[PDB]
Amino acid sequence: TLEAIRYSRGSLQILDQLLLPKQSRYEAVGSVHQAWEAIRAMKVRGAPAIALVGCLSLAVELQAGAGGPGLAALVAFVRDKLSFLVTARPTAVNMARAARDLADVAAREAEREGATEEAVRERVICCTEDMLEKDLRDNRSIGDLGARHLLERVAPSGGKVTVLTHCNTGALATAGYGTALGVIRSLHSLGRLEHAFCTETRPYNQGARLTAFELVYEQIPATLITDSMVAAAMAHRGVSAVVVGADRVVANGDTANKVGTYQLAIVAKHHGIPFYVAAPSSSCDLRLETGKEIIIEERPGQELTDVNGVRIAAPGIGVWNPAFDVTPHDLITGGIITELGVFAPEELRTALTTTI
Amino acid sequence: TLEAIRYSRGSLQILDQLLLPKQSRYEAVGSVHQAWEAIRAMKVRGAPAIALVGCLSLAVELQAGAGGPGLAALVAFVRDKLSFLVTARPTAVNMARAARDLADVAAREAEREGATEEAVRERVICCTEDMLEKDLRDNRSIGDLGARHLLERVAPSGGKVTVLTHCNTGALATAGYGTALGVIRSLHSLGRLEHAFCTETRPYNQGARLTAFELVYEQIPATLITDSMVAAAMAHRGVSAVVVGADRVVANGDTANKVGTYQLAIVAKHHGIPFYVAAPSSSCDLRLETGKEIIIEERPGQELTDVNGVRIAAPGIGVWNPAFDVTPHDLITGGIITELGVFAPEELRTALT
């Protein structure tokens, strides 16, 4: 119901994150170029959402009858818009990945016997619409499967749970519903969520800005705390499970995620509560054997020292501003929640490649 | 060293913390009333510093020939200003503690045979100056004894250390030198400090504002990080020890301190590095046995949701803003550093009884 992407045939709107959280407002995305400019201006947030916004905007152009006339002029049209869509924010694989599928889908269809301009046009549109429903359905699965495994682990006989989360993994990082925040939604909709705790997530503040927003909007009983209150909250506020998202999960289950996650896992262990990572398999990168092989992005120190255009920190001080940390898999005590089920880290590699 | 208090007989100045960390400005305090206002204004921070600024301000007035005349007049004068000083900012009980003792000092001295007005005047000034020296010399023992113990524990083979700290515990929270930051200063003078890490310490941002300022000022090699960055810094930036301050230490060594401290202790233990609480014995409270007797103050949520007059947090979210958490003595693996030296939590009661 909370939608950062609104799409219907011939109609695409996006929620402008630049205006959040004071104001929630939608912007109409008329063209591939508008999507490109919106993605780059960071109105659209989350690699899976960014991918979906670019491809959906192509389908709007196609619905409008853009591309061609011809067919090879239309395949050419599609491939050009995608490779241009890949240019917007090559932060991540999602756009490039989706571009291949569709472009492959167009080619296979154009290469079909009796192929026409019209067949390719609709086919590309329909697969694009398949993508969107697929992300929504997947995120729903992560939330439901995650909520179920968690209840079985923590309160199997009935009884509510209190969940603490980190950064933003909800409707504002995805097509809709979210991952870790999806799990919270499912618990809540089952009437089994006592309370949700969300951290500020310095220095980019996605937890204070975006997660708090979603929880208020959903009228989910929630409390915001600082990153540094996480242990006290586990000790004195009855937290019984921790669920986080992932930037990247590697083959052994080591998980790169927004910084503070590795701290959360340590603190969860100490208070003996299960630590869950919730991520789609498209977020699991099975090339890397270990979290060692992950480069940690370091961002400019000013982004840590300054907030809202004003420097808070003392002048001259050195700064370390890693965007992420890596959580070793032995701390992922709850599991890794995917659209294909919840997995113990040692099981992840084999389960992803051998089950549908 | 950095001075938030510059005092000479007949001259008192204070660093204005409001203008930090962008500017350094020193303000004269010629009167008890002026000190009272600077304290209300929060130009002066740290309970021991507040108490000293007030007592020294009376000392400055007492140097002025102010108070009296007679003897019994001067005592009432001293006692009136001290009781007056307490009114400004009573959350810190250090001023109230100081007022009694000084009032007791003026009285005890007034009570001597052959008493003179002059003898009480000077005595009260001299006592005030002794108080300042004691705070300074005590904080220095905390730093020196802490650093020597920390080095023997962590780098017995020689070699430099990297220390991570939390909130502000330096010259800007004390009379000078500081406690946990005093330990970092002492490691630095010994040439044994590789680096210092200081946390932001949300939501009042003392580490970002004040600690960073102190470290830069002393040209101590230092790096500021967020509170959520602590685990990654231990694991990947070679932290060899954690040293923090204390709001309060109870008899078993359970320690109440600026929130996030309990988190640091957990994370420190994970990475197998010693956790140190640095606190003067005057901050150790033998009346409570156990951390379970400590009541945690919760501050207003707007102080967490807003930075610098602007709401960061989304509208309508509930907020928890405890000022402190309590660290169980089991996690204090380095020890408790007092002006007498480093104590294991279990040694502490008999050491201070």
Residues of B with CB below 8 A from A202's CB? 200, 202, 226-228
Q: How far apart are CA B162 and CA B238, in angstroms?
A: 7
**Beta strand B241-244 pairing with B324-327:** unpaired
Q: Which domains occur in chain A, in start order? A: 1-158 (1.20.120.420), 159-356 (3.40.50.10470)
Q: List the one residue out of A276, A269, A217 whose CA is nearest residue A245.
A: A276
Question: CB of A323 within 8 Å of any CB in chain B?
Answer: no
Q: Select the residue of A208, A229, A305 nearest B260 (Cβ to Cβ).
A: A229
Technique used by the depositors:
X-ray
Question: CB of B54 within 8 Å of any CB in chain A?
Answer: no
Q: Select the residue of B213, B267, B314 nearest A266 (Cβ to Cβ).
A: B267
**Beta strand B241-244 pairing with B275-278:** parallel
Which of B215, B217, B218, B263 should one mutate to test binding to chain A, selecting the residue with the greatest count of A CBs within 10 A?
Answer: B263
Q: How far apart are CA A243 and CA A145, in angstroms?
A: 13
DSSP 8-state symbol, A208:
I
Contact B246, B171 (CB under 8 A): no
Q: How far apart are CA B3 and CA B170, in angstroms?
A: 10
Strand segments, DSSP code E, in A141-217 are 161-165, 193-199
Q: List the one residue out of A192, A189, A118, A182 whose CA is nearest residue A146.
A: A182
Q: List the one residue out of B19, B142, B102, A313 whose CA is nearest residue B27.
A: B19
Q: List the one residue out of A132, A156, A193 whose CA is nearest residue A9.
A: A132
Task: Pick the residue from chain B with its C-alpha nearest to A267.
Answer: B266
Q: How far apart are CA B77 and CA B195, in angstroms?
A: 49
Residues of B with CB below 8 A from A313's CB? 21, 200, 208-209, 212, 224
Residues of A with CB below 8 A from B15's CB? none
Contact B296, B325 (CB under 8 A): yes
Structure's resolution in angstroms: 2.5
- Number of neighbours of residue B347 by Cβ within 10 angstroms: 14
Q: Select the residue of B20, B230, B314 nearest A21 (Cβ to Cβ).
A: B314
Q: Is A104 a catalytic residue?
A: no
Joined tokens for residue A306: 């300054």
Q: List the one residue out of B112, B110, B44 whose CA is nearest residue B77.
A: B110
State CA B61 to chain mean position distance. Answer: 26
- Give the CA-trace dihedral at B253, B256, B257, B260, to 10 degrees: 100
Residue with tokens 């954690």: B242
Asked if A212's CB is within 8 angstroms of B313's CB, the reply is yes
Contacts within 8 Å (CB) and 24+ apart, B125-128:
B125/B9, B125/B59, B125/B62, B125/B63, B127/B102, B128/B55, B128/B56, B128/B58, B128/B59, B128/B102
Per annotation, catalytic residue among A135, A247, A254, A325: A247
Catalytic positions of B, written as ranges: 247
The dihedrals phi and psi of B278, each to the nearest 5 degrees, come to: -105, 120
Residue with tokens 């499912």: A186
